[PDB]
Amino acid sequence: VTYTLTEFNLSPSLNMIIGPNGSGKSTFVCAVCLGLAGKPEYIGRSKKVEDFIKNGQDVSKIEITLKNSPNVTDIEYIDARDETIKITRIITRSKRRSDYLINDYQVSESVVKTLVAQLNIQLDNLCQFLSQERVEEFARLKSVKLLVE
Amino acid sequence: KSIVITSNTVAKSELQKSIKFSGSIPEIYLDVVTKETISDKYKDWHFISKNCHYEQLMDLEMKDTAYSFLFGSSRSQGKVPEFVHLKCPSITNLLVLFGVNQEKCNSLKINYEKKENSRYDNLCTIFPVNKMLKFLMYFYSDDDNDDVREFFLKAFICLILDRKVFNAMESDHRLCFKVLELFNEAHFINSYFEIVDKNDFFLHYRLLQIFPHLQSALLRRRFSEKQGRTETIQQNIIKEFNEFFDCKNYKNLLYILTMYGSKFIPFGPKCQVTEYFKDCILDISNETTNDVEISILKGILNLFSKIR
Amino acid sequence: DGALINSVLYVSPRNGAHYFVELTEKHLLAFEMLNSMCLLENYDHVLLFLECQFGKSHNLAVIPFDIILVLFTLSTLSEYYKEPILRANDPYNTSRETLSRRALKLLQKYLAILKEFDSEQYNLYDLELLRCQFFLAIDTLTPKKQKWGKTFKNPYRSYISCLEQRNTILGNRLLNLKLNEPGEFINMILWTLSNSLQESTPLFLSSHEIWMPLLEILIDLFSCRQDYFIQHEVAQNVSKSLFVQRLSESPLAVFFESLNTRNFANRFSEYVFLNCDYKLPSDNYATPVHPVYNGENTIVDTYIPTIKCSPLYKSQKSLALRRKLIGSCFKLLLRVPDGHRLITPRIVADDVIQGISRTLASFNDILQFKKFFMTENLSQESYFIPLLAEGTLSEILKDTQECVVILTLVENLSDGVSFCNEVIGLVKSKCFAFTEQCSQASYEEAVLNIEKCDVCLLVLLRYLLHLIGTEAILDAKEQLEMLHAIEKNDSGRRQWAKALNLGNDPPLLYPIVSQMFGVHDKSVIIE
Amino acid sequence: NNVGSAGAVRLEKPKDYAEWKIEIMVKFRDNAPLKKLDSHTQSGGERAVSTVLYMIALQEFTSAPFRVVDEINQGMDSRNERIVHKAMVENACAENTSQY
Amino acid sequence: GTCFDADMDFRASLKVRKFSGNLSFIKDTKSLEIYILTTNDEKARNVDT
Amino acid sequence: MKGTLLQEITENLLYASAIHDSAQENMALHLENLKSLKAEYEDAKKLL
Amino acid sequence: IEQVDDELLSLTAQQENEEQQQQRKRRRHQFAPMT
Questions:
Q1: Chain E contacts of B295, Cβ < 8 Å?
Q2: Chain F closest CA to B194's CA: distance in Å?
Q3: Cα–Cα distance between C99 and C85 in angstroms, integer?
Q4: A69 annotated as a binding-site residue
Q5: Strand order across the beta sheet in which A106-108 lies
Q6: CB half-sphere exposure, C433, CA atoms < 13 A
Q7: Given the DSSP bridges, would you call strands E20-26 and E31-37 parallel, antiparallel or unpaired?
């Protein structure tokens, strides 16, 4: 939406994005989240796949590159000594399936999901990812929930 | 041998039994209600003593909100008869729908012998006051005999004096002011004094809270010059103050709240009547073992003396 | 307009206030007495001082502005959750009424006194002083900058205010201080609008006992302040560009500045109609709402809720409050010069009209729709209600019929003949007529759209009667042909009434137009 | 410390093991007494800052490469938001930190 | 009542010197605080000041 | 407070309140002893 | 503690005497109208 060709650079220490809500910045962040084996209903928010897809364009594409270390298994085309993991998510209207890309190779969502699991990063858990519904849930937080976490 | 807890056990129990409410009713509410012994906050005149017929009243309400004319209801043309007579043909049926029982509808008076002016709240749900006043205005019918108008007036007076209606009453008494303007003010005061006792100054003060502009007129009905022989109204006020002071009816004496502000007993520092009242109040007041009404009178009289 | 806006005889304008009125000896003593009593937490005698001389005298006892703020805070101490505190403060309930209820009643009665200047009933100095006090309170209640989520200045030097040394009344923080926080004014508005239709007893009690009356009072006071600002604070003649800048500083501009959000149109449309029957479009994010004063959402054990309100009553009151909010918005907007647009609030009349029309045409319950469009006083709401009616009608015709016929009815309210001709054009186009493309299965939604269409046209027709009366309904053949075309659409709907898709009769507006200006079905039954 | 408040995440351990609970000490507001975190009693901005800092504390121990926070920099009173931005700056001063 | 009378009489007494003040009785501090505003300042300083 | 004769009132009130609290505690103790005597005398009535 | 009960009874008797003294007092002002 309003961004058909965009590139973003992210600081190694910490990142800041400035922009009004609804201008695509939240859309871009959600696209980045969905790229790494993410689904709209697994982030504690409403699912709108058509919002990501550009109105008129068939396919919307997000690419995310991460550092690679020899501590994660079930990878395609990428060696352990390699330092690059490229994960691509595409959303299209005609096709309804979970197909991701690892270094530009088509895979099921299971492979990317188990990779995300093996990177010690979690999407459903509220500690790693914080959303508006999750902010509200933390707002009224009981000691039992603290013990549980 | 020990079978009761002070006198609260019987009072709390028999308040709990006649409670007309389907809920929890925590024992803390019963304890705070039945252990007053100082003020009569929880004992008041309750015209509505049964749960309102919610379904039929809502039917009347959806009929009233949307209908053919969709215009202001005129005092004539029967006040949209076509559905109101199908639902509630008579004003007594409407009052039954409101929650008044048939026995009180037949005799629209406050029975002071049965202590109907001092009853615990029955915790009965009431229908909103404005819509009730609208349904009652639907039965005004100016063009009829005097008996029907008198019954309507007395029913309205009983309704507005109800504790629940007064508490759930709106800030602006638009419908109440309309009903009052339907009738003559002197006629209204005469009917009101037919309903309530003449020395029941608590309901006098409540009425003057509802309709302050009646104050002077009410006094002209309580201490009327012709009915007071050659004595003036101020002399009659002094005599009534004396009799309440000697009888030690300090609550009725306090509900002073009715007199002040009128032409006879005005606010101000230089009035003689207020000085005499305060002189007697400071006579009785001991501040160690007294009725609270004495201190309340002292404070109220001081405040009214300061008001210029 | 009235004297409330154009009575400046006794004013002594200052830098902070232009409505400022100096105190006289009697009013100075009254102010001192009220503040002294309020210092001792003797709120019962404050209310008794105000009530004992209300309506019993020609002269008026003016409430000081800080006492007005005290009463505003007292109105938030509802019995249903503050019964122990109120009983502790006043063990001998000599008035047989809660402090909250008495304070609220005094506020509403004095607002009624202020809204009309009876110079014969009350002398002009007291009325101007009361206006100054209310305006000072409102100016102290300026909203903070909107947040997604200076102490006290006394203009009078003749007395020490009670609010200088305190910020809470009975454990409740002062209303101005609570609302002079970044995200609390919008929070209060959303809270009352959401709980106005709640079936939960504590939330509905919070809306019905505390916040809807207070919001009514605040909106009325802000409207009066806006009128006074436009009358005096502006520089009369202006280059039409400095006037927009001054309007951006207007009390209503600051009022709605705490409601700007990101997109004023859609967010405002959702805000006003929060917790209504309409389906939420485009999965708008839910608006968090929290109680303003601690445990507003709880009912104390001692209090027993013994009042029941029918759904029609609650819906009517909520929709009336929503209309008041929208009317304040349009009152601010209509003063904006054509071409120019406001700087600080990014608000446009067309955007708000379209958003309200989108939310109204999406109502799936007709009761709330009618409650919004049924008003007891046509002249009061005459400046924005016809616009909303025509916009909702246009949108309904757009979604129901592929050919959107342009509606000029609002300016056609000037000439009844033009209005009737346009009605004939719409009905002959079959856009107002019941549409054949609608299927049997989806008959209910089509009925809903048609009955909303009829409501909008009925509103416009009532406004036409209000502006032209009943003079040439039959004298001009155009209005007669409009009535006969209404009968033609009656026959068109009756076609499917006889098609027997459902037993329920479709909405037919011939009897209603007959009752209003159809001369009781023309000559069907008259002759 | 940047807030100028003292607080610690204590694990109260009664005799029953399941009755062990978590206590958070609050000092950002002098009026607010030391109590468990809750939305209604405390202000929104201070509560948001406290929970954000609690999230930040449980980051170095976790092996997640980074943490994601949404609808956070939206203003909290322009003061609590300022101090939480200062805390974020201080955390970013340390190297090998998670990207937010 | 007593504190109200004392407060009002103190306010009326201070007008002789063209001042404006008030009494405040506090049970938390068990103290009586006098606040006086004279001609020069614009804030009611404590009477000890 | 002393000159306005409000200090003596508060002194008497607090003395009476302290007496009331102590008497209430002793009243609870008396209730316990009375129930104990009730049980003992009920045992005596069984012996009778 | 029997001394507490004795103090309670003494205070109650003092209150009884005080309320009797209050009950004994009458009105002393006659309200001469005069001027």
A1: 1
A2: 46
A3: 11
A4: no
A5: A59-67, A84-92, A99-102, A106-108
A6: 21
A7: antiparallel
